[PDB]
Write an enzyme that holds these catalytic residues in place. Structure first.
Site, PDB file in Angstrom:
ATOM      1  N   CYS A 107     -27.286 -48.138 -47.568  1.00  0.00           N
ATOM      2  CA  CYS A 107     -28.170 -47.176 -47.536  1.00  0.00           C
ATOM      3  C   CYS A 107     -28.852 -48.163 -48.934  1.00  0.00           C
ATOM      4  O   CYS A 107     -27.918 -47.506 -50.171  1.00  0.00           O
ATOM      5  CB  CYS A 107     -27.749 -45.433 -47.979  1.00  0.00           C
ATOM      6  SG  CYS A 107     -28.541 -44.907 -48.624  1.00  0.00           S
ATOM      7  N   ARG A 110     -28.679 -45.170 -52.831  1.00  0.00           N
ATOM      8  CA  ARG A 110     -27.280 -44.449 -53.158  1.00  0.00           C
ATOM      9  C   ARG A 110     -27.379 -44.633 -54.160  1.00  0.00           C
ATOM     10  O   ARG A 110     -26.260 -43.968 -55.402  1.00  0.00           O
ATOM     11  CB  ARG A 110     -26.349 -45.684 -52.799  1.00  0.00           C
ATOM     12  CG  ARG A 110     -26.036 -45.329 -51.156  1.00  0.00           C
ATOM     13  CD  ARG A 110     -24.713 -46.616 -51.282  1.00  0.00           C
ATOM     14  NE  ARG A 110     -24.987 -47.686 -50.912  1.00  0.00           N
ATOM     15  CZ  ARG A 110     -24.586 -49.115 -50.773  1.00  0.00           C
ATOM     16  NH1 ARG A 110     -23.787 -49.026 -50.943  1.00  0.00           N
ATOM     17  NH2 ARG A 110     -25.146 -49.610 -50.628  1.00  0.00           N
ATOM     18  N   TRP A 279     -33.842 -36.954 -48.758  1.00  0.00           N
ATOM     19  CA  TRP A 279     -35.565 -36.967 -48.869  1.00  0.00           C
ATOM     20  C   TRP A 279     -35.870 -38.529 -48.667  1.00  0.00           C
ATOM     21  O   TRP A 279     -35.300 -39.449 -48.290  1.00  0.00           O
ATOM     22  CB  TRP A 279     -36.207 -37.166 -50.298  1.00  0.00           C
ATOM     23  CG  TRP A 279     -35.928 -37.505 -51.437  1.00  0.00           C
ATOM     24  CD1 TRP A 279     -36.101 -39.081 -51.385  1.00  0.00           C
ATOM     25  CD2 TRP A 279     -34.806 -37.363 -52.539  1.00  0.00           C
ATOM     26  NE1 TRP A 279     -35.358 -39.471 -52.991  1.00  0.00           N
ATOM     27  CE2 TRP A 279     -35.132 -38.504 -53.226  1.00  0.00           C
ATOM     28  CE3 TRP A 279     -33.967 -36.300 -52.752  1.00  0.00           C
ATOM     29  CZ2 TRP A 279     -34.014 -38.544 -54.128  1.00  0.00           C
ATOM     30  CZ3 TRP A 279     -32.895 -36.404 -53.509  1.00  0.00           C
ATOM     31  CH2 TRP A 279     -32.880 -37.766 -54.618  1.00  0.00           C
ATOM     32  N   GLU A 284     -40.179 -45.073 -43.637  1.00  0.00           N
ATOM     33  CA  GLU A 284     -39.769 -44.435 -42.585  1.00  0.00           C
ATOM     34  C   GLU A 284     -40.330 -44.315 -41.667  1.00  0.00           C
ATOM     35  O   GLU A 284     -40.111 -44.023 -40.542  1.00  0.00           O
ATOM     36  CB  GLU A 284     -38.356 -43.310 -43.655  1.00  0.00           C
ATOM     37  CG  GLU A 284     -37.119 -44.197 -44.350  1.00  0.00           C
ATOM     38  CD  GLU A 284     -36.155 -43.252 -44.701  1.00  0.00           C
ATOM     39  OE1 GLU A 284     -35.255 -43.087 -43.429  1.00  0.00           O
ATOM     40  OE2 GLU A 284     -36.128 -42.882 -45.722  1.00  0.00           O
TER      41      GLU A 284
HETATM   42  C1  HEM Z   1     -31.051 -38.276 -50.958  1.00  0.00           C
HETATM   43  C2  HEM Z   1     -32.470 -40.111 -50.757  1.00  0.00           C
HETATM   44  C3  HEM Z   1     -31.775 -40.386 -49.898  1.00  0.00           C
HETATM   45  C4  HEM Z   1     -33.226 -41.665 -49.288  1.00  0.00           C
HETATM   46  C5  HEM Z   1     -34.081 -42.375 -50.011  1.00  0.00           C
HETATM   47  C6  HEM Z   1     -32.651 -42.919 -48.493  1.00  0.00           C
HETATM   48  C7  HEM Z   1     -32.334 -44.014 -48.152  1.00  0.00           C
HETATM   49  C8  HEM Z   1     -32.033 -43.975 -46.260  1.00  0.00           C
HETATM   50  C9  HEM Z   1     -33.245 -45.621 -46.012  1.00  0.00           C
HETATM   51  C10 HEM Z   1     -34.353 -45.674 -45.712  1.00  0.00           C
HETATM   52  C11 HEM Z   1     -31.941 -45.321 -44.962  1.00  0.00           C
HETATM   53  C12 HEM Z   1     -32.022 -46.921 -43.805  1.00  0.00           C
HETATM   54  C13 HEM Z   1     -33.046 -45.323 -42.513  1.00  0.00           C
HETATM   55  C14 HEM Z   1     -32.823 -46.117 -41.227  1.00  0.00           C
HETATM   56  O1  HEM Z   1     -33.542 -47.245 -40.700  1.00  0.00           O
HETATM   57  O2  HEM Z   1     -32.474 -46.234 -40.032  1.00  0.00           O
HETATM   58  C15 HEM Z   1     -30.347 -44.764 -44.908  1.00  0.00           C
HETATM   59  C16 HEM Z   1     -29.397 -44.964 -44.255  1.00  0.00           C
HETATM   60  C17 HEM Z   1     -28.323 -44.956 -44.945  1.00  0.00           C
HETATM   61  N1  HEM Z   1     -28.589 -43.715 -45.411  1.00  0.00           N
HETATM   62 FE1  HEM Z   1     -29.563 -43.188 -46.869  1.00  0.00          FE
HETATM   63  N2  HEM Z   1     -30.939 -42.337 -47.940  1.00  0.00           N
HETATM   64  C18 HEM Z   1     -30.958 -40.758 -48.602  1.00  0.00           C
HETATM   65  C19 HEM Z   1     -29.951 -40.172 -48.893  1.00  0.00           C
HETATM   66  C20 HEM Z   1     -28.501 -40.080 -48.008  1.00  0.00           C
HETATM   67  C21 HEM Z   1     -27.755 -38.910 -48.762  1.00  0.00           C
HETATM   68  C22 HEM Z   1     -27.691 -38.063 -48.920  1.00  0.00           C
HETATM   69  C23 HEM Z   1     -26.714 -39.686 -47.167  1.00  0.00           C
HETATM   70  C24 HEM Z   1     -24.961 -39.205 -47.354  1.00  0.00           C
HETATM   71  C25 HEM Z   1     -24.413 -37.952 -47.608  1.00  0.00           C
HETATM   72  C26 HEM Z   1     -27.189 -40.337 -47.267  1.00  0.00           C
HETATM   73  C27 HEM Z   1     -26.000 -42.441 -46.196  1.00  0.00           C
HETATM   74  C28 HEM Z   1     -27.260 -43.083 -45.456  1.00  0.00           C
HETATM   75  C29 HEM Z   1     -26.230 -43.937 -43.971  1.00  0.00           C
HETATM   76  C30 HEM Z   1     -24.192 -44.062 -43.906  1.00  0.00           C
HETATM   77  C31 HEM Z   1     -27.044 -44.621 -43.642  1.00  0.00           C
HETATM   78  C32 HEM Z   1     -27.018 -44.885 -42.689  1.00  0.00           C
HETATM   79  C33 HEM Z   1     -27.823 -45.016 -41.157  1.00  0.00           C
HETATM   80  C34 HEM Z   1     -26.810 -46.154 -39.936  1.00  0.00           C
HETATM   81  O3  HEM Z   1     -25.598 -46.536 -40.227  1.00  0.00           O
HETATM   82  O4  HEM Z   1     -27.662 -45.912 -39.284  1.00  0.00           O
HETATM   83  N3  HEM Z   1     -28.676 -41.049 -47.600  1.00  0.00           N
HETATM   84  N4  HEM Z   1     -31.076 -44.009 -45.928  1.00  0.00           N
HETATM   85  C1  LIG Z   2     -30.122 -38.416 -45.823  1.00  0.00           C
HETATM   86  C2  LIG Z   2     -31.019 -39.711 -44.884  1.00  0.00           C
HETATM   87  C3  LIG Z   2     -32.661 -39.885 -45.967  1.00  0.00           C
HETATM   88  C4  LIG Z   2     -33.360 -41.046 -45.325  1.00  0.00           C
HETATM   89  N1  LIG Z   2     -34.482 -40.831 -46.195  1.00  0.00           N
HETATM   90  N2  LIG Z   2     -32.715 -41.702 -44.576  1.00  0.00           N
HETATM   91  C5  LIG Z   2     -31.660 -41.154 -43.537  1.00  0.00           C
HETATM   92  C6  LIG Z   2     -31.278 -42.459 -42.368  1.00  0.00           C
HETATM   93  C7  LIG Z   2     -31.892 -42.377 -41.506  1.00  0.00           C
HETATM   94  C8  LIG Z   2     -32.590 -41.744 -40.863  1.00  0.00           C
HETATM   95  C9  LIG Z   2     -33.325 -40.436 -40.538  1.00  0.00           C
HETATM   96  C10 LIG Z   2     -34.697 -39.634 -40.859  1.00  0.00           C
HETATM   97  F1  LIG Z   2     -35.025 -38.438 -40.687  1.00  0.00           F
HETATM   98  C11 LIG Z   2     -35.509 -40.911 -40.689  1.00  0.00           C
HETATM   99  C12 LIG Z   2     -35.310 -42.117 -40.896  1.00  0.00           C
HETATM  100  C13 LIG Z   2     -36.569 -43.405 -40.536  1.00  0.00           C
HETATM  101  C14 LIG Z   2     -35.631 -44.555 -40.107  1.00  0.00           C
HETATM  102  C15 LIG Z   2     -36.778 -45.433 -39.555  1.00  0.00           C
HETATM  103  C16 LIG Z   2     -36.653 -46.415 -39.039  1.00  0.00           C
HETATM  104  C17 LIG Z   2     -36.452 -46.317 -37.444  1.00  0.00           C
HETATM  105  C18 LIG Z   2     -37.648 -44.747 -37.622  1.00  0.00           C
HETATM  106  N3  LIG Z   2     -37.728 -44.811 -38.946  1.00  0.00           N
HETATM  107  C19 LIG Z   2     -33.772 -42.549 -40.654  1.00  0.00           C
HETATM  108  C20 LIG Z   2     -30.931 -40.794 -44.489  1.00  0.00           C
END
Ligand code: HEM
Ligand SMILES: Cc1cc(N)nc(CCc2cc(F)cc(CC[C@H]3CCCN3)c2)c1
Ligand code: HEM
Ligand SMILES: Cc1cc(N)nc(CCc2cc(F)cc(CC[C@H]3CCCN3)c2)c1
Ligand SMILES: C[C@H](O)[C@H](O)[C@H]1CNc2nc(N)[nH]c(=O)c2N1
Ligand SMILES: C[C@H](O)[C@H](O)[C@H]1CNc2nc(N)[nH]c(=O)c2N1
Ligand SMILES: [Zn+2]
Lengths: 408, 413
Positions: A107, A110, A279, A284
Site C-alpha cells: 500500500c 500508508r 480514497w 487506479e
Molecule cells: C487512504 C488512501 C489510500 C490510498 C491512496 C491507497 C493506495 C493504495 C494503492 C494504489 C494500492 C495498490 C492497489 C492495487 O493496485 O490493487 C493499495 C493497496 C493496498 N492498500 Fe492501500 N490505499 C489507501 C488506503 C488503505 C486503507 C484504509 C487500507 C486498510 C485499512 C489499505 C490497505 C491496503 C492493502 C492491504 C493493500 C494491498 C491489497 C492487495 O494485496 O491486493 N489501504 N493501496
Molecule cells: C482502501 C484502498 C484505497 C485505494 N486507493 N486502493 C486500494 C487497493 C484496492 C483497490 C480498490 C479499488 F476500488 C480499486 C483499485 C484499482 C486497482 C487497479 C489495478 C487493477 C484495477 N485498477 C484497487 C484500497
C-alpha cells in the site's frame, strides 16, 4: 543483521532493523525470488500468536510488563483454554486494524495509517445487520466527497463453518455482462460476480455503470442481496480540462474505493469480513480500470478522438492516450471536490512515510512491484527507492473466494 | 524446494510451469523472511572449488549438443581435470566459449532483449596481451556491432582471471558514454551519471572538450597493468540527433545520443572461469534513452525544458505535465532512430517479444528467470504485457555478474 536500502536518485541510505521481527514467510528462498508472484486454528497455535500481539500492544503504549499487561496475558490464556478462542478489547481491535494497514507492504497510502476510523461490528449476527453496518461505513467514509479512511470489522472466524463474508470484492463496483456477440458490457473484471448476483435474483439494468448489489454472508449462512441506497454512492462524471469531446465518452466512476474481500489477522484471530476504504490514486482508475485489456479497454477510443497514428506501436499512441485519460480523471474528481491523489504526490508521501518509519520504527516493509505506479514509473521517487519486503503482523491477507467454499 | 513452480499471467490467464529453477546455482539475496527483489546489488578459485564448477559446465555443454556421456564428453572431462590439477585452471575450447557467452545472456534475468540470445556474435580476444591490443579488439567490436546502423549483438571476451593481480578490465562502464563535468557553482555539464569516471580520465591525461555530448575515451587495463587512454575514432561512433515528428522546436534542444549500448564493466562467469573484461552490445530500447537518460532527475533532466516549450501547467503535479512531456520525448527518440535507420525497439514491441520468448523458454527449457523489477519498462508499465506476467527470478550459470569498480581495487604500478 541490519539491512541497508539505498535511494539511487537521492543517495539516501536507510537502515532496516524491523525485519528482524517477522515470522510469516515471503515465499522467496535463497535460490528463487517470488517478488512478482501475486499469491505465494487451535488453542495450541493460538496463545503464542495472542501473546506476541498482546506483547507488542502493551509495548506500543509503553506499559510492557505492567500489571495491566500481565493480567491481560492470563485473561487471554484462560479464555483460550476454556473457549478455544478469545475476544480483543476495543483498544486492541483499533490498534490491530491500524497496524494491519501500517504493515500492508503493497500500500502506497500508508502515510495516513494512524488516521483510520475503526467500526467495531463484532456484535453483528445477520446479513441485514451487515448491510446496516456497511451503509453506515459507506456514508461515513464518503462524507460528501471529503473521503475518510475507515474499516468495519465483523465477527471473527470461529470454526470455519460460520464465517462472515462480504462476497463482493469491493463494496462499490460496476457490473460486467457477457454479451451474446462475444464482448463484454460494463466491467469485465466482475463478469463472474455479476452472474452470481443475477443467479441469486438480482435484476440487472444491463447498463455500462450499474452498481452491483451487496451479497452478504453472516455466520456461514447463504448470502443475501442488498441494494446500497443510491444517494450513498458518490460518482464522478469523467471529463477533460481541454478536450471537450471527452465528456461525450459517457464515462464515470465511483468515488469510494473499498476493499471487502480480504482477511484481517490480529493476534491469531481471523476477521474474514473487514471491508476497508480510503480514497483513490488516479492511476487506479485511469490506467487499469479503463485501459487494461481485460477491463474497460478505451485506449483505442480515446486515441481515435485524439486522431493519433495507431498503425505502429512506436508512435506511442497508447502512451499519449493513457496520459490524457489520467489527466481527465484527476481533473474530474478535483472539480467535484472528491478526494483523490495523483501518483506523483502519493509516491512523494510514501517516500516521506518510509523515512518516518525507518526513523521511529526501524523499517517499513514495502513491495516495490506494487508500490511503483502502473505508469510513468521512473519519474516517480519510489522507482529509485530500494525496498525490503517482509511480513509483519497484524496483517491483511488474501483468502479464498466464498463461492469456491460455501456449502449452500 | 518443490519440483514444479507455477507462474500466472493475470491479463491472459495463461499459467506456465517452471522446472528450470531446480538448476539454480548461486543466491538471490532473498530469504524465507525477507525479499530483496528490488535491491540493485543484493583472490581466485581453488582447485577443489574449480573441478565441480567445470564439470557442471562441461556436462551442460555436452548435454546441449546431444553428446552427453559420449567419449568426447568423458575425454573433455578428463582433459579439464588434468589441466586444473597441474595448472590450477583450464582453458575453454572455442565452441564452449561461444556456448557459455550465449547462455550467460540467455540466463540474464534482468534483460528484456533475450529473444535474440542465440544470435550473439562472439569475438575471442583471449590472445590479447596489451591495452593497445584491447583497443584494436574493441574498435573492431564497435564497427562490427554498429554495422552502419543495422546493429548486431556482439561480445568481445578478453583473457580470464588468473591470480587476480593480472586482470583485464575496461574501466569504462559502457564503451560509448558522454562525459560529465561538475562546475564550481555546483551545476553539471554533460551527463551527471559520468562525473566520477570523467574525472579519472582527466587525471589520467585526457584533454576534455568540456561540452554537452563529448564521447569519453576508453580506459583500458591489460594483464593487471595501469590502464591506458585511447580515443575511439569518432567515425566509429554512430550518433542520432533527436528531433520530433510534430514539434519543430524539439531539434532546437540540441539533443543527440549514440546508437550502440555496450556494457563493459561486467564479469562473465563460465564453468568457474572469470572473464573480467567482456564488453557486450546490442541495440537500445527507446525508454533507456527517452526516460532514464533524458528524464531522470540526476541525468540530463530535460522534462522541465520540454514541458516549457510545450506550454504545460507546471504548478500542479495533477496536471501530469511530467508524464505528458515524457511521452513526447520518447516519441522523438524512437522517431529519430527510425528516420536515421539505426536499430531501436520501442517498449511495446520489446515486451511483447519477451513474453513470446519467455513462453517458448518455459516450453523448450523448463523456465525463464526474469527480474520483473527490471523487465517492466520505466514508463507506461501496465499497458505492456510484462506488467501482468508473474516471473520467477533465479541465478543460472554461465552468467553476467557485477564486479567492483577497477579504480577501487587497482594496485597502481
Ligand atoms: C487512504 C488512501 C489510500 C490510498 C491512496 C491507497 C493506495 C493504495 C494503492 C494504489 C494500492 C495498490 C492497489 C492495487 O493496485 O490493487 C493499495 C493497496 C493496498 N492498500 Fe492501500 N490505499 C489507501 C488506503 C488503505 C486503507 C484504509 C487500507 C486498510 C485499512 C489499505 C490497505 C491496503 C492493502 C492491504 C493493500 C494491498 C491489497 C492487495 O494485496 O491486493 N489501504 N493501496
Ligand atoms: C482502501 C484502498 C484505497 C485505494 N486507493 N486502493 C486500494 C487497493 C484496492 C483497490 C480498490 C479499488 F476500488 C480499486 C483499485 C484499482 C486497482 C487497479 C489495478 C487493477 C484495477 N485498477 C484497487 C484500497
Ligand atoms: C540485442 C538487444 C538488447 C536489448 C534490446 C536489451 C535490452 C536490455 C534492457 C532494456 C535492459 C535493462 C537496462 C537498464 O535499465 O539498465 C537490459 C539489461 C541487461 N542486458 Fe540486455 N539487451 C540487449 C542485448 C543484450 C546482450 C547482447 C547482452 C549480453 C550478451 C545483454 C545482457 C544484459 C544484462 C546482463 C543486463 C543486466 C544489466 C544490469 O544488471 O545492469 N543484453 N537489456
Ligand atoms: C547490451 C545492452 C543493450 C541494451 N539496450 N541495454 C543494455 C543495458 C545496459 C545499458 C547500457 C547503456 F548504454 C544504457 C542503458 C540505459 C539503461 C538506463 C539505466 C541508466 C540510464 N538508462 C543501459 C545492454
Ligand atoms: C530501486 C530499484 O531497484 C532501482 O531503481 C531499479 C528499478 N528497476 C530498474 N529497471 C531497469 N531496467 N533499470 C534500472 O536501472 C532499474 N533500477
Ligand atoms: C505479475 C504482477 O505481480 C502483477 O501484474 C502485479 C504487478 N504489480 C501490480 N501493482 C499494483 N499496484 N497492482 C497490481 O494489481 C499489480 N499487479
Ligand atoms: Zn524475493
Amino acid at each position: 543483521r541490519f539491512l541497508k536500502v539505498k535511494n539511487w536518485e537521492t543517495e539516501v541510505v536507510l537502515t532496516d532493523t524491523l525485519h528482524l521481527k517477522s515470522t510469516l514467510e515471503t515465499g522467496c528462498t535463497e535460490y528463487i525470488c517470488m517478488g512478482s508472484i501475486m499469491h505465494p486454528a487451535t488453542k495450541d497455535q493460538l496463545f503464542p500468536l495472542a501473546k506476541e500481539f498482546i506483547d507488542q500492544y502493551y509495548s506500543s503504549i509503553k506499559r510492557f510488563g505492567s500489571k495491566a499487561h500481565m493480567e491481560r496475558l492470563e485473561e487471554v490464556n484462560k479464555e483460550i483454554d476454556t473457549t478455544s478462542t478469545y475476544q480483543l478489547k476495543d483498544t486492541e481491535l483499533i490498534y490491530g486494524a491500524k497496524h494491519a494497514w501500517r504493515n500492508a507492504s503493497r500500500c502506497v497510502g500508508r502515510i495516513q495509517w494512524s488516521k483510520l476510523q475503526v467500526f467495531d461490528a463484532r456484535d453483528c449476527t445477520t446479513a441485514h445487520g451487515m448491510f446496516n453496518y456497511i451503509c453506515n461505513h459507506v456514508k461515513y467514509a464518503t462524507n460528501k466527497g471529503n473521503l475518510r479512511s475507515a474499516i468495519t470489522i465483523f465477527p471473527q472466524r470461529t470454526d470455519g463453518k460460520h464465517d462472515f463474508r462480504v462476497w463482493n470484492s469491493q463494496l462499490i463496483r460496476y457490473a460486467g455482462y457477457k454479451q451474446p456477440d462475444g464482448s463484454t458490457l460494463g466491467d469485465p473484471a466482475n463478469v463472474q460476480f455479476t452472474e452470481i448476483c443475477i443467479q441469486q435474483g438480482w435484476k440487472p439494468p444491463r447498463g455500462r455503470f450499474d452498481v452491483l448489489p451487496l451479497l452478504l454472508q453472516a455466520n456461514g449462512n447463504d448470502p443475501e442481496l442488498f441494494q446500497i441506497p443510491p444517494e450513498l454512492v458518490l460518482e464522478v462524471p469523467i471529463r477533460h480540462p481541454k478536450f471537450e469531446w471527452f465528456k461525450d465518452l459517457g464515462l464515470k466512476w465511483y468515488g469510494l474505493p473499498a476493499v471487502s474481500n480480504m482477511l484481517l489477522e490480529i493476534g491469531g484471530l481471523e476477521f474474514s469480513a473487514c471491508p476497508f476504504s480510503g480514497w483513490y490514486m488516479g492511476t487506479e482508475i485511469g490506467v487499469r480500470d479503463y485501459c487494461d485489456n481485460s477491463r474497460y479497454n478505451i485506449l483505442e477510443e480515446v486515441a481515435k478522438k485524439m486522431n493519433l497514428d495507431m498503425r505502429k506501436t512506436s508512435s506511442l499512441w497508447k502512451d499519449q492516450a493513457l496520459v490524457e485519460i489520467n489527466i481527465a480523471v484527476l481533473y474530474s474528481f478535483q472539480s467535484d471536490k472528491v478526494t483523490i491523489v495523483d501518483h506523483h504526490s502519493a509516491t512523494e508521501s510514501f517516500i516521506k512515510h518510509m523515512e518516518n518509519e525507518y526513523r521511529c520504527r526501524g523499517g517499513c516493509p514495502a513491495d516495490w512491484v506494487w508500490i511503483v505506479p502502473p505508469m510513468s514509473g521512473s519519474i516517480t521517487p519510489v522507482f529509485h527507492q530500494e525496498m525490503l519486503n517482509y511480513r509483519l503482523t497484524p496483517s491483511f491477507e488474501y483468502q479464498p473466494d466464498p463461492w469456491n467454499t460455501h456449502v449452500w
